[PDB]
Design a protein around this ligand. Structure first.
Ligand SMILES: OC[C@H]1O[C@@H](O)[C@H](O)[C@@H](O)[C@@H]1O
Ligand SMILES: [Zn+2]
Length: 330
């Protein structure tokens, strides 16, 4: 079907031959709950490595648009926003990646989760890569499950930067993250910090604390993946203005009222399935400034954030709140 347009007015105010090119990693998270983030008040240190990195902003009031991967991911990149979003027609709308690609930003999507749920479908096929494959992902033999790890998506990104030398670049890394029910499979042994761990597939039959322990160990591995993603960006900070955005697609029920996993219709889904973490990191020289940590935010903030990071204006989101501010200190 023909593409329905939303941002044909979009203009990029500055080009990478007149200022530093910009390089952004957007980590599309999976199944992570805001209330299990240390920064949000959780009594366990689930993000020790991010805690040591300067310039990380944690956002304490972020609500997902939905409770599943197929529903939330397209909306996260949409112009319609959660209130007018239609999952069944999202694929035919111009989305924020379409706009950025059209204006010259090089887009890459690596996926260790499933796929882009239609978001990459209008862009050239080679700009999407399946990193659940052990012949794309070199980090699948570190665990007895032979499960490919999110950090494997960082291997060879330097090839992409070199192939796009001096251009603006936006790289999506779609995480396996905290996907259940087998939380215990989601992390290598070095992250088996909270013990004992539920290693059964029937969650209600595990002792509750052992389920929480497995879930929190999986968060430690995501803390590590985000920290290494920032470290990778930092190797490019002299030539590029580098930033990292993380937002989870939805949360997770962990036995409250006997509910497990996610995917429940928004009308009656419990809050645990909607309250998600978000982090923003940027290098000091970029001039990008985060919004207040307690700003009331939703997935609708993602599209204007991605546009602002590349100096793009679009009428459709002119009134939207982003994760980053409009004002600039000189
Ligand atoms: O029930 C169908 C859909 O309803 C939405 O409100 C939820 O966010 C989705 O996860 C679900 O798939
Ligand atoms: Zn998901």
């Amino acid at each position: 079907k023909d593409t329905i347009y939303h941002a044909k007015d979009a203009v990029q105010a500055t080009k990478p031959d007149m200022r530093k090119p910009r390089l952004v990693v957007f980590v599309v998270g999976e199944t992570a709950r805001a209330d299990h983030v240390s920064f949000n008040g959780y009594e366990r240190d689930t993000f020790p490595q991010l805690a040591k990195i300067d310039g990380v902003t944690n956002f304490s009031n972020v609500t997902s648009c939905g409770t599943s991967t197929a529903y939330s991911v397209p909306c996260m990149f949409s112009y319609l926003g959660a209130d007018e979003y239609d999952v069944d027609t999202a694929k035919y709308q111009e989305n924020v990646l379409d706009t950025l690609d059209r204006l010259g930003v090089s887009i890459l999507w690596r996926d260790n989760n499933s796929d882009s749920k239609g978001v990459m479908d209008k862009l050239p096929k080679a700009q999407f890569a399946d990193y659940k494959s052990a012949t794309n992902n070199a980090i699948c033999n570190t665990n007895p499950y032979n499960e490919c790890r999110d950090v494997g998506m960082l291997v060879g990104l330097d090839d992409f930067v070199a192939a796009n030398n001096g251009k603006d670049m936006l790289i999506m890394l779609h995480q396996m993250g905290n996907h259940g029910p087998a939380y215990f499979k989601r992390y290598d042994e070095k992250f088996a910090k909270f013990t004992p761990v539920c290693e059964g597939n029937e969650l209600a039959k595990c002792e509750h604390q052992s389920l929480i322990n497995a879930y929190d160990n999986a968060l430690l591995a995501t803390d590590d993946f985000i920290a290494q993603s920032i470290q990778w960006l930092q190797t490019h900070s002299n030539a590029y203005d580098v930033s990292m955005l993380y937002v989870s697609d939805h949360g997770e029920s962990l036995g409250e009222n006997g509910v497990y996993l996610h995917g429940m219709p928004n009308a009656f889904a419990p809050k645990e399935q909607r309250s998600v973490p978000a982090f923003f990191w940027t290098d000091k020289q970029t001039g990008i400034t985060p919004m207040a940590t307690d700003t009331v935010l939703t997935h609708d903030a993602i599209t204007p954030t991605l546009l602002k990071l590349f100096d793009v204006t679009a009428d459709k989101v002119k009134d939207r709140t982003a994760f980053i501010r409009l004002e600039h200190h000189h």
